């Protein structure tokens, strides 16, 4: 049995992708972060917002 996977990089939005990384969520300490593609560096704290 054979399966040939093949992939199109065409002009419509990119739409199939491999599974994204995730980690535990530490608080009250200085860290780097990525949230859903939002990157930064900071102390993360529970919001009143």
């Amino acid at each position: 049995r054979v399966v040939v996977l093949s992939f199109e990089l065409l002009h419509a939005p990119a739409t199939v992708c491999g599974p994204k990384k995730s980690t535990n969520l530490v608080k009250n300490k200085c860290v780097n972060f990525n949230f859903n593609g939002l990157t930064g560096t900071g102390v993360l704290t529970e919001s009143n917002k």
């Binding site: 002009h11 419509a12 939005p13 739409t15």
Partner: protein, 49 residues
């Protein structure tokens, strides 16, 4: 009749990665085969106001 005077901000509903080139659109209306109210006797299609 008419739109009401006042300010109102529409919220995001959905966002579809569909890639198609739209240039035209059309509305879809309900046509009732029969009465707007049970127990009329008039023939053929109707629409509510």
């Amino acid at each position: 009749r008419d739109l009401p005077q006042g300010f109102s901000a529409l919220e995001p509903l959905v966002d579809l990665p569909i890639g198609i080139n739209i240039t035209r659109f059309q509305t879809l209306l309900a046509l009732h085969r029969s009465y707007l109210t049970p127990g009329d006797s008039s023939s053929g299609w109707t629409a509510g106001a």
